Structure formats: C-alpha cells, structure tokens
Amino acid sequence: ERLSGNQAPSLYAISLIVVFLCLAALYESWSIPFSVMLVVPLGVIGALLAATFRGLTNDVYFQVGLLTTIGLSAKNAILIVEFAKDLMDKEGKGLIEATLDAVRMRLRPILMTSLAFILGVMPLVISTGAGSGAQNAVGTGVMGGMVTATVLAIFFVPVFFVVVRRRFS
C-alpha cells in the first residue's frame, strides 16, 4: 500500500501523447489527429452512465472495457477522417462534400461492428452463475460505452474534422 500506489495519470498521459504522434505520422499533420482524439469522451460517458445506473465501480474490468470502447470509436473516427482527406487530396473535393461522402460510406461498417459487438456482450450483461460478477462488470461498461460511442461519433466526428480543418488553414 505505502511503498507504491496510483501511477495511472503517468502511463495514460504517455498513451495520449503516443496516440497523437502515431496519428500525426498517419495523416502527415500536427492538427488532423485532434479530429480523431476528440471522440474519446463519447464512449466514456456511456460506460460511466451504464456502470453508475447498475451500481458498479471503476474497476479493472471497467477500465480494460473502456480502452476497448475508445479503440473502436477512435478506429471509426480514423477511417472517417482518412476517407474525407483522401477525397480532398486525390479526388480534389471540397471540405463539406468530402466529409459527407466519408460518413455516408463509413455508416454501414460502423453500425455493422457496433451492433455485432453490443449484442455479442449481451450474454455478459445478463450473465448469472459462476463468475457473473466479472462478466456483468465487463459487459455493462462496454455495452454502455459502445452505444454512446456509436450514436454520438457518427454526428460528432464530421464536426471535429470540419472544425479542426478550418482552425488550421
């Protein structure tokens, strides 16, 4: 207890920095990464709501389930931003037109994944019997996080990209 305790902000600060750097290399831009990194909270709110309204705690299973939720939501945002930038760079489309083409093309695969995984973790949410405490804890945070991440991201990612692209020329 007394020798060492709570090194959480340190490792997730590095994580946040390295994710930014990796995105900066991917997009060849110091600014465009922010359009993807601003989706993190969209999946966190839903996980926190789910865990709060089921009387669960911020534990290991909530944390790893939240990193998974952030992973997919960020991955969805990356492919939306990538498709938009492609249309602007290669096809030479406008900011708005390209962003609308991106989200239009990326809707089906986003929902396909979201529904598959949300429904896939249903057995864990409603789980009873041996180890249900861990199953309930995993599924609850993920299901809650995935639904907010899915519904919010599809409307917010296009705002993030358009807003970020405009502030930085």
Binding site: L11, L48, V64, V103, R108, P109, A116, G120, G131, V163
Partner: protein, 240 residues
Amino acid sequence: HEVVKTLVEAIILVFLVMYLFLQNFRATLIPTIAVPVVLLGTFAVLAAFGFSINTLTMFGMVLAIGLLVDDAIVVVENVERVMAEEGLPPKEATRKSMGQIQGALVGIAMVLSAVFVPMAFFGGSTGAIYRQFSITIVSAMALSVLVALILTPALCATMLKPIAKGDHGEGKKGFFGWFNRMFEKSTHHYTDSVGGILRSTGRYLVLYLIIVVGMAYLFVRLPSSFLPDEDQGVFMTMVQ
C-alpha cells in the same frame, strides 16, 4: 468455461448481425471465420510468451472480438461497396479495396497498440493483472491485421457473390427487401442530418463541452474498486 461459452455465443451473435447486412451465407462466414482464426492464434502467442489461460486473458479474448470483426467487416464491407459503386467482379473489387485500406489497417493497429501497451508497464501487484489484457489484446490485433491481409482478401475474392453496379439489394423481396430500402433511406436521412449539423457547428462544440463536463462529474462520483468479490461456491467460519 462460462467465458469460453460467451466467446462461442458472441461469434454466433456476430454471424446473425453479419447475415442481416450481407444477406448471403458464404459472405457471412468471411468475418465469422476471421475471429476464431485470430483468437486461436492469440492462444499460441500467449503460449510463446509464457502466459496462462486465466479470467483476464479470457476476457481479453472476449473484448478482442470487437477489434477482430471490425478488421474483417472493414475489408468485407469495402469490397461490397466497391462492387456496388462500379460493378467490378469480386476478385477485381477485392484487389482494388485492399489497395486503398490495407495501409490504414496496419497504421490503425500501431495507433491502437499505443492505447493498450502502456498499461503493460503498471508496477507490482496491479502490474501483472493489466499486463494479461495488454499482451492478449495487442497480440490479437497484430494477428487480426495479418489475417486481414492474407485470409480475408482470399475469402472475399472466392466466396463473395458478384454485385451489379447500383444494386443495394432494394430489389430483393421479403425482409431483406424492406431492410435494404429502410437502410438506404436511413443513410439519406443521416447525411441530410449531418449536412445540417455542419452548417450549425458552434452549437455542437458547446454541446460537446457539456458531454465532457458530464463525463468528468460521473468519473469522480463513481466509486473505484479493483477486482469484484466472486461467489466461488465455498466460504469459511472462524470460531475464536
């Protein structure tokens, strides 16, 4: 064994949600085959690194499924979209589709590794717990990309049914006929909605700050624990 059962159940539920969108048996198997191939592969990587089959590594497999199907779905869906927009045969659309996303798939895995790797550097007691998830999930993602570059393309070129240019399955009769027309209309409603959001913009930046402050409040209110107390079908009573 209860977590192993929810893996099987999750793969079956993945299959059904895939059949709702792809609407043909062969196409539905491409994402459904990719998951167990990667997951089984992940067990061999845990074996190489001296890790064990445990609650945390097993839940690593369950959480991984989301990242695995997405890799497979991104590849399969994009081929279907190319086939529908241009009318290329499966083999040509596959070559084309892989050409424009294979770079991103590899890039995404390195961005996502930067999310999961860090918590493998927690120290002492808590360290080993978080390290089980990190290595399980990161190993699965690595295999997922390698499976997305070898098998998924090969299956897409051989198992996917040729789609004619402009055909979004709206001409089908039955449930798929109605669903395809519902989704195509819903996609127009979506883009029309986003198109309107992009004109406002400012009122969503302020709404986003509300979601972030809402998040912050819930985070500090929510009590923090470590690992739940499980009913293990046994307990003890002390007489002093």
